[PDB]
Design a binder for this molecule. Structure first.
Ligand code: CLA
Ligand code: CLA
Ligand code: CLA
Ligand code: CLA
Ligand code: CLA
Ligand code: CLA
Ligand code: CLA
Ligand code: CLA
Ligand SMILES: CCCCCCCCCCCCCCCCCC(=O)O[C@@H](COC(=O)CCCCCCCCCCCCCCC)COP(=O)(O)OC[C@H](O)CO
Ligand SMILES: CC1=C(/C=C/C(C)=C/C=C/C(C)=C/C=C/C=C(C)/C=C/C=C(C)/C=C/C2=C(C)CCCC2(C)C)C(C)(C)CCC1
Ligand code: SF4
Ligand code: SF4
Ligand code: SF4
Lengths: 160, 73, 73, 42, 81, 143, 742, 73
């Protein structure tokens, strides 16, 4: 018996599988910033923005229309920053669409074992707003750091 | 020119047939005597009575748009 | 060429809309009690003859035009 | 034999016989009077 | 905010409209206008999906049960999610 | 005076190995349905959410997401296994609404005490034309 | 226990059931009340599972229908052999295969159709055939029309025997149910007696007849002066002159000195330079080895004697932790359901047909087959279409099994239950795979088209641009090119000429096969192929899995396998049945096979087919434009459709004008299908009401009340006419293009 | 595909897509406010007709202008 019902419940639309409920996979998912409920959403947003803005620079620089010119390092990186300016904007709209000022967090207040848990502040107006601001700051910081590493400090790289 | 003008007449007559049938059966027919109670645009009347797809006058307009496009083409 | 094609497609769409809005009038605004034995109610009285004669004209035109074209080909 | 004649009287078999006879007549007419565009007998 | 299911007086009394309902909208109530001494009724049209199985089994010349599609909810759109 | 049977939360559930067709977020933010029946023998039935389950002897309770699923399962139980079934609707607030037999008797057969809703005392062709109901909220079939 | 269980005279041979239409079921034998009954009479004619609930009568009807199909196939084969004997230029084609077009059909001189009798060569006027029967007959050693006449007479006799057997095994001596459920003996006999003994007999024919006759033909000997095939059997020295090992008899076989037979049993590989096909010695050794393998593979399953394997025990022995009880219960499912067997066999036969088409194009097994470009194109396209149709029918009948023959109360399988429990995960993952493949396969074409239209050719996904090279396929080609060096030292040459090297076979100034290059264009087309196949799989598997129930209709199995809808409720429940999933997947199979055959045609016309000059240069048909043009949709529209349609639109007034007429008619039928596909029944019924009034006015309305076609029948007519038109268009276009220039 | 393929297949596909989004880690954080459903039958007919008409007009306009501008006469 490797495939179990979802938390012993066969009438919930899901299953327990080694890809779903492995201890290593559960640990890795729990240590991600999006699942750090007790931490300030500003810090988790900063981390998420840093990672995503850092990874976004590469495709824009290497596959942009100016990838074979001198302006490959700057303009494509700028495009990555522009995407962050788009992405956070989308997040902001989500924060206005879903959560209201007067309502508390809508995150689940229980765990798998059924014990009482403080709900995550991310699923709230203030929490999502702080998360989006941290995402924007981390995104622009990560784009700047990627540009500094590849083209300002001139670290050796394979550049794909 | 004779053949293409007669094809043009065929297209005009067929599009008129579709549109006039929709307009005159809009209020009802033997299959759906109370079509007027269901408005201008409704999907169908279910699979009963043999099947009632494209029974509304809006669907007659939708079918006749294809024939109008073919005629103008 | 662009002007002719543009205005002919516009005219076809507008005629299709004319027939569609006539059907809309029949569903929504037509009053049988105020239109008894009119020239408008008598269309619904003999709608079968109109639709069948339109069907005959379209079928005859399509049959013979397609037959002549296929014969030539 | 009555059942076989009833089967021969059904729609596809009778249609096949009738249309085959008609097609044969038209083909023989087109062989003996080929390339007919007008009616010149009158 | 539900599909409108209406019962007319031409109802014979056959319960096929009720047996053909997958959401328990219709039921059979007593009546006196037919031999069967019963007529259909629609008290739970809030659960009506609009499948029109009820009027696909009505044997009259035209349907004594009529489902008019109307404003749609989560249980009228057949949404399990 | 028929009284609705109360829901028993401690009712055991059929033996099922888990499926992806079960409940979703709609069961949490909105209502979900619960069907209870009484199996006289431990047998195997087919779930409406795909797959097969093994009902246990005695009372059985199953939670589904739609009323149509509950009614389809109940019809299968009544036709194939001849089991009496009742299903309820449960809200996130904990409210339970006893749904299917509104008077303890199946809706197909006539039972006294039912009131007529949506009853029109005319033939279907005697409906009022839409032009006579224009600019009023009343529909021709509602009159 | 495995005996011959047969009941005598179960069904009386009479014409009473001929006189009554629709006798097989009850709702139809009552007589027609409307016109729809007629269509129903042609819809439930071969649905034996709905006529009766007894498996024995269903199985007997299946057996006799198979006999009738075999009789029809034998009749068709007799017709082809007769039309190759009379009304053919096979004897003329034998002398000059590289300049005389094969022809086996002549039209009669009526209404000016005699223009279709084209100058195919060899003093013959007739329709050029592309079925490749001439190559089969040359590979079989047939050098005279009398042999073809004898084969036609024998096939007529065999068709009569099949028809008599079909009548006998249903009306006189019908097998019992336990006779059909003896799957072990059936598998043993069909692996050892049908495939094994058939391969052994064909190897014997190739060794004793095809090899010496083909050696004489390739030696330049005139066909009428070649000794008759029986003369090489009665005279062993005549065969021994060509192959000296025949002087030793069968003693090297019985003494295990098989290496003495290395003159007519060779593992040579490659192609014959004289004929452009596979070596017939290679085919003889191949069929011998296949016969041995099938004969020792047919003594596996258990029967009346205790030795052997039990299929039930083999299935029950395989069960894992993930799958639980495993394959237990599948034997009872497969032995009591004809639809499951039909699904499995249809899938396997469609895949087999597809791999057959690929291996025939890659290795031509008949003499002068590769240099016949029309035959190659026709065979590849035809077997691609057959395979796609059978693969679609596999899911079509798997859905019927799930709706009708599936139940977990009895005949319960754990694997099928676990598949049905996580069907949402399978469908969603396949949906994501389809979206990802569609984007990263077709958006690349859109990107290339936009970059070329914007004047940015350096930004495309081309060979002279951003390169997407198939490194894995090129590595496989390189590995198979050097297979005779290290991995297969017993093979003289490689298994095909389509991998690499300096090898090139050209017969009669035409290229037979070349090392096929693989580049970015092949990469894009192959990923397009994968995307189309995955989408068709998604549609068919979704239909199979949700044929019983879903979150929308929990009681879809009660509605049936083939029903139109469940009304306009739940927002609309149109095409929820699995039959509609098959109807949708038919279009996607058509799309996938059309893209595949377009790829094959353009790639072989640009990089393989062509002509060889006396100096040594090679000039292809389209000049190798596939590498630079096929990467854009505009390239496919212009350099493939527009450029190669000039041979089918200009065929009027010549012998290929029938292809132009079929081009136009197929376009017409494809357009005609859209009327059924886009419309609905209610409008047509309301129009039929007015036509019925017009007929009733003149007392000419029929008693059978005219009714519009049903929703399912309307969809079926639409998809049938759609497939017919869209396939006949490609048929006419391919045939005219490859006959006019090839 | 808005004209040939119809609603139930797409609704049953959207149900599985909604299940996949509700059970995908790092994506259950983002939830829809409006429940995704398939296109309505009349809505899908209109969408298919709009795509059909746009294709008709744009294709013939491109062909006409390109033919009469690559050679003016
Ligand atoms: C569908 C596939 C597709 C692809 C792959 C490309 C690819 C390319 N195009 Mg084309 N293009 C397409 C379709 C496509 N195009 C279409 C439909 C159009 C409209 C006509 C165009 C029109 C177009 C234009 C107008 C231009 C391009 C250009 C480019 C480049 C992108 C530049 C950039 O800003 O984006 C990069 C964006 C990214 C953020 C990439 C995201 C992908 C990430 C890395 C996913 C990796 C997945 C990961 C492994 C998943 C698991 C995670 C793990 C942790 C578990 C690139 C070479 C530019 C150019 O000319 O250069 C050649 C440009 O100017 N394209
Ligand atoms: C290009 C293909 C095509 C064709 C040929 C037709 C043909 C026709 N349409 Mg359809 N239609 C089409 C596409 C097409 N439609 C599309 C895309 C739509 C949009 C959904 C519609 C929607 C539509 C509507 C809404 C209406 C029609 C109607 C008609 C009829 C018009 C009158 C006439 O021309 O009859 C001449 C007949 C023909 C051209 C068709 C027959 C072809 C030859 C003559 C067949 C002879 C048989 C031959 C021996 C083959 C043997 C068969 C077998 C043994 C092999 C005719 C049956 C109108 C109507 O019903 O009129 C009565 C009408 O109400 N059509
Ligand atoms: C639209 C309708 C149509 C019409 C009016 C015609 C008209 C004609 N066709 Mg064309 N044709 C059509 C469609 C049509 N065709 C189509 C769709 C096809 C493709 C299937 C063809 C293909 C075709 C061919 C292949 C041929 C014709 C020919 C003919 C001619 C008459 C044949 C003959 O000799 O009759 C002779 C007279 C009769 C059979 C009368 C019979 C009356 C009986 C015996 C009763 C006597 C009364 C007592 C005439 C010009 C022929 C030709 O040569 O054209 C110049 C011919 O060879 N047609
Ligand atoms: C697989 C199916 C098959 C097919 C598609 C064809 C196709 C064709 N045959 Mg071939 N043929 C076949 C099997 C087949 N044959 C077999 C098994 C034999 C052996 C007897 C022959 C022997 C044969 C002869 C001897 C002739 C043809 C001819 C023809 C042409 C049709 C002429 C005709 O029959 O109209 C006439 C159709 C009628 C309906 C007349 C009545 C005939 C009865 C009803 C048929 C069944 C009776 C036995 C056509 C190219 C003709 C040819 O090509 O000559 C140039 C011709 O003369 N065939
Ligand atoms: C070793 C002998 C043997 C052979 C050769 C076959 C061969 C065949 N069987 Mg199988 N079968 C066998 C044993 C055998 N069977 C046994 C013992 C059983 C019972 C367990 C079955 C059960 C069975 C069923 C239920 C069915 C078949 C079918 C078929 C045919 C499908 C393959 C095909 O058409 O290819 C083409 C193959 C040929 C034309 C090559 C020549 C084979 C000759 C003509 C057959 C003579 C074989 C026969 C068994 C022996 C004669 C009996 C005697 C009284 C005359 C094929 C003719 C299917 C079918 O098509 O039935 C009509 C089918 O429905 N078989
Ligand atoms: C996943 C694995 C698997 C795969 C890939 C296949 C694949 C194949 N099997 Mg199947 N099979 C399987 C599991 C599998 N099987 C199991 C577990 C069983 C035991 C129940 C069978 C039983 C079985 C039998 C008994 C036969 C096959 C045959 C075949 C081949 C069909 C040939 C065809 O295409 O028609 C081309 C034409 C023919 C040769 C086949 C003629 C039609 C056959 C005889 C009818 C099938 C009847 C079957 C016994 C159903 C009876 C129902 C009964 C309970 C009432 C096909 C390649 C056939 C084969 O061996 O061919 C060489 C065959 O005879 N299979
Ligand atoms: C290999 C053999 C095979 C066999 C034995 C079966 C067996 C069967 N099929 Mg399956 N099927 C197969 C392959 C096969 N199928 C394939 C390859 C497909 C994919 C297309 C399907 C898809 C399929 C569907 C979609 C359905 C079935 C169903 C059925 C059952 C009834 C068939 C019927 O009544 O039609 C009797 C015969 C006809 C209706 C003939 C129709 C005419 C065809 C479509 C035209 C072919 C065009 C022709 C080449 C053009 C010439 C022009 C013309 C003028 C002559 C029966 C169990 C039906 C079912 O079980 O219903 C519940 C059903 O719904 N099958
Ligand atoms: C010819 C046009 C056409 C197109 C483009 C599609 C598109 C699609 N089909 Mg449909 N379909 C069609 C005809 C078409 N179909 C027809 C004729 C039928 C009748 C049988 C169907 C029936 C049908 C079925 C039955 C199924 C589909 C499925 C699919 C989807 C899978 C492909 C995928 O997602 O890859 C990615 C998307 C595409 C390749 C579409 C083009 C997008 C390009 C590459 C990029 C556009 C650029 C970008 C978005 C920028 C936008 C600009 C901005 C201004 C908005 C996709 C939405 C399958 C599906 O649902 O699986 C997920 C499915 O099961 N289709
Ligand atoms: C991604 C697709 C994942 C499919 C998982 C299927 C599964 O349950 O795993 C089986 C297979 O596990 C795998 O290796 C899955 C392979 C995934 C890739 C499939 C494509 C082929 C490459 C378990 O096999 P078993 O040994 O437990 O029993 C098998 C059978 O009943 C006989 O005992
Ligand atoms: C010869 C000539 C002449 C004369 C002319 C004429 C006289 C013409 C006419 C014409 C016409 C006469 C036309 C018409 C047309 C029509 C149309 C186009 C129509 C349409 C319709 C519709 C669209 C409809 C609608 C509707 C409906 C549906 C129903 C309800 C109502 C309504 C009405 C709304 C003159 C001397 C001057 C000069 C010289 C030449
Ligand atoms: S298939 Fe026809 S009858 Fe059924 S829901 Fe769709 S339009 Fe209505
Ligand atoms: S509503 Fe229909 S099913 Fe019910 S009693 Fe009336 S006629 Fe019978
Ligand atoms: S439409 Fe369907 S759910 Fe509504 S009353 Fe009729 S049968 Fe019941």
């Amino acid at each position: 018996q490797v495939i179990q019902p979802l938390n012993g419940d066969p009438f919930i639309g899901g299953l327990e599988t080694p890809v779903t409920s492995s201890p290593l996979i559960a640990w890795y998912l729990s240590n991600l910033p999006a699942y750090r409920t007790a931490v300030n959403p500003l810090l988790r947003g900063v981390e998420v923005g840093l990672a995503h803005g850092f990874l976004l620079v590469g495709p824009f620089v290497k596959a942009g229309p100016l990838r074979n010119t001198e302006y490959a390092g700057a303009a494509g990186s700028l495009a990555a920053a522009g995407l962050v300016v788009i992405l956070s904007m989308c997040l902001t709209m989500y924060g206005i669409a879903s959560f209201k000022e007067g309502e508390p967090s809508i995150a689940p207040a229980l765990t798998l074992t059924g014990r009482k848990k403080q709900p995550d502040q991310l699923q709230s107006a203030d929490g999502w707003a702080k998360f989006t601001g941290g995402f924007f700051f981390g995104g622009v910081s990560g784009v700047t750091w990627a540009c500094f590493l590849m083209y300002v400090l001139d670290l050796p790289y394979y550049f794909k | 020119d004779f053949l293409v003008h007669h094809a043009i007449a065929l297209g005009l007559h067929t599009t008129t047939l579709i549109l006039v049938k929709g307009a005159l059966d809009a209020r009802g027919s033997k299959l759906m005597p109370d079509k007027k109670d269901f408005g201008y645009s409704f999907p169908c009347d279910g699979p009963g009575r043999g099947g009632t797809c494209d029974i509304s006058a809006w669907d007659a307009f939708y079918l006749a748009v294809f024939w109008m496009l073919n005629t103008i083409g | 060429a662009a002007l002719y094609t543009h205005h002919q497609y516009i005219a076809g769409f507008i005629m299709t809309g004319a027939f569609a809005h006539g059907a809309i009038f029949f569903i929504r605004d037509y009053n049988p009690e105020q239109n008894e034995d009119n020239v408008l109610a008598r269309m619904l009285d003999h709608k079968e003859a109109i639709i069948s004669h339109l069907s005959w004209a379209s079928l005859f035109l399509g049959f013979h035009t397609l037959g002549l074209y296929v014969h030539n080909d | 034999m009555r059942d076989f004649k009833t089967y021969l009287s059904v729609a596809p078999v009778l249609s096949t016989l009738w249309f085959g006879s008609l097609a044969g007549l038209l083909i023989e007419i087109n062989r003996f009077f080929p390339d007919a565009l007008t009616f010149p007998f009158f | 905010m539900s599909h409108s299911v209406k019962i007319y007086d031409t109802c014979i009394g056959c319960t096929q409209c009720v047996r053909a309902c997958p959401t328990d909208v219709l039921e059979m109530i007593p009546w006196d206008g037919c031999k069967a001494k019963q007529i259909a009724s629609a008290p739970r049209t809030e659960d009506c999906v609009g499948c029109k199985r009820c009027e696909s089994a009505c044997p009259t010349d035209f349907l004594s049960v009529r489902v008019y599609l109307w404003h749609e909810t989560t249980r009228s759109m057949g949404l399990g999610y | 005076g028929f009284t609705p049977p109360e829901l028993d939360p401690n009712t055991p559930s059929p033996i099922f190995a888990g499926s992806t067709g079960g409940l979703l977020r709609k069961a949490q933010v909105e209502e979900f349905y619960v069907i209870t029946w009484e199996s006289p023998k431990e047998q195997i039935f087919e779930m409406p959410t795909g797959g097969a389950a093994i009902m246990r002897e005695g009372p059985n309770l199953l939670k589904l997401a739609r009323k149509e699923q509950c009614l389809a399962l109940g019809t299968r139980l009544r036709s194939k296994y001849k089991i009496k079934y009742q299903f309820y609707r449960v809200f996130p607030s904990g409210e339970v609404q006893y749904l299917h037999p509104k008077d303890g008797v199946y809706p197909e057969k006539v039972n006294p005490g039912r009131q007529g809703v949506g009853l029109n005392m005319r033939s279907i062709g005697k409906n009022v034309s839409p032009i006579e109901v224009k600019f009023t909220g009343k529909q021709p079939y509602d009159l | 226990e495995v005996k011959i269980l047969v009941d005598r005279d179960p069904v009386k041979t009479s014409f009473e059931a001929w006189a009554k239409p629709g006798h097989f079921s009850r709702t139809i034998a009552k007589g027609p009340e409307t016109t729809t009954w007629i269509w129903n009479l042609h819809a439930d004619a071969h649905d034996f599972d709905s006529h009766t609930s007894d498996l024995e009568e269903i199985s007997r009807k299946i057996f006799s229908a198979h006999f009738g199909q075999l009789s029809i196939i034998f009749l068709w084969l007799s017709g082809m052999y007769f039309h190759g004997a009379r009304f053919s230029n096979y004897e003329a084609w034998l002398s000059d295969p590289t300049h005389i077009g094969p022809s086996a059909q002549v039209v009669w001189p009526i209404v000016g159709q005699e223009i279709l009798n084209g100058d195919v060569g060899g003093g013959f006027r007739g329709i050029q055939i592309t079925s490749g029967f001439f190559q089969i007959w040359r590979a079989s050693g047939i050098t005279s029309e009398l042999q073809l006449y004898c084969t036609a007479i024998g096939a007529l006799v065999f068709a009569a025997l099949m028809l008599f057997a079909g009548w006998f095994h249903y009306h006189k001596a019908a097998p019992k149910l336990a006779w059909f459920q003896d799957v072990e003996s059936m598998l043993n006999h069909h692996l050892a007696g049908l495939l094994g003994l058939g391969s052994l007999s064909w190897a014997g024919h190739q060794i004793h007849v095809s090899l010496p006759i083909n050696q004489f033909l390739n030696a330049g000997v005139d066909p009428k002066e070649i000794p008759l095939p029986h003369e090489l059997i009665l005279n062993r020295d005549l065969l021994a002159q060509l192959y000296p090992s025949f002087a030793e008899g069968a003693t090297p076989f019985f003494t295990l000195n098989w290496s003495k037979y290395a003159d007519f049993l060779t593992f040579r590989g490659g192609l014959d330079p004289v004929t452009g096909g596979l070596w017939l010695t290679d085919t003889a050794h191949h069929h011998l080895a296949i016969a041995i393998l099938f004969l020792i593979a047919g003594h596996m399953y258990r029967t009346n004697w205790g030795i052997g394997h039990g299929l039930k025990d083999i299935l029950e022995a395989h069960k894992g932790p993930f799958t639980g009880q495993g394959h237990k219960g599948l034997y009872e499912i497969l032995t009591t359901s004809w639809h499951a067997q039909l699904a499995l066999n249809l899938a396997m036969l469609g895949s087999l047909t597809i791999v057959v088409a690929h291996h025939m194009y890659a290795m031509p097994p008949y003499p002068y087959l590769a240099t016949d470009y029309g035959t190659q194109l026709s065979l590849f396209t035809h077997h691609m279409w057959i395979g796609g149709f059978l693969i679609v029918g596999a899911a079509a009948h798997a859905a019927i099994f799930m709706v009708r023959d599936y139940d977990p109360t009895t005949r319960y399988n754990d694997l099928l239950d676990r598949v049905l429990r996580h069907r949402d995960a399978i469908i969603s993952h396949l949906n994501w795979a389809c979206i990802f493949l569609g984007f990263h396969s077709f958006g690349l074409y859109i990107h290339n088209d936009t970059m070329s239209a914007l004047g940015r050719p350096q930004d495309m996904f081309s060979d002279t641009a951003i390169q997407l090279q198939p490194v894995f396929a090129q590595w496989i080609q390189n590995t198979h090119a050097l297979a005779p060096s290290a991995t297969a030292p017993g093979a003289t040459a490689s298994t095909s000429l389509t991998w690499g090297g300096s090898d090139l076979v050209a017969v009669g100034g035409k290229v037979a096969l070349l090392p096929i290059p693989l580049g970015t264009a092949d990469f894009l087309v192959h990923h397009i192929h994968a995307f189309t196949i995955h989408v068709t799989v998604l549609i068919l598997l979704k239909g199979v899995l949700f044929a019983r129930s879903s979150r929308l209709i929990p009681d879809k199995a009660n509605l049936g396998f083939r029903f139109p809808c469940d009304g306009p409720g739940r927002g609309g429940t149109c095409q929820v049945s699995a039959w509609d999933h098959v109807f949708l997947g038919l279009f996607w199979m058509y799309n996938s096979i059309s893209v595949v055959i377009f790829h094959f045609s353009w790639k072989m016309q640009s990089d393989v087919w062509g002509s060889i000059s006396d100096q040594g240069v090679v000039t292809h048909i389209t000049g190798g434009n596939f590498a630079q043009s096929s990467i854009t949709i505009n390239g496919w529209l212009r350099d493939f459709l527009w450029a190669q349609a000039s041979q089918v639109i200009q065929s009027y007034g010549s012998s290929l004008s029938a292809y132009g007429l079929f081009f136009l008619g197929a376009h017409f039928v494809w357009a005609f299908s859209l009327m059924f596909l886009f419309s609905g029944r209610g409008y047509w019924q309301e129009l039929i009401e007015s036509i019925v009034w017009a007929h009733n006015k003149l007392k000419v309305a029929p008693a059978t009340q005219p009714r519009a076609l049903s929703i399912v029948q309307g969809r079926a007519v639409g998809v049938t006419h759609y497939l017919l038109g869209g396939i006949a268009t490609t048929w006419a276009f391919f045939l005219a293009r490859i006959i006019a220039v090839g | 595909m808005f004209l040939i393929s119809w609603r139930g297949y797409w609704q049953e596909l959207i149900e599985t897509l909604a299940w996949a989004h509700e059970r995908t880690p790092l994506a259950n954080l983002i939830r829809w406010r409006d429940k995704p459903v398939a296109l309505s039958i009349v809505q899908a007919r209109l969408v298919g007709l709009a795509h059909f008409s746009v294709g008709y007009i744009f294709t013939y306009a491109a062909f006409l202008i390109a033919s009469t501008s690559g050679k003016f006469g």
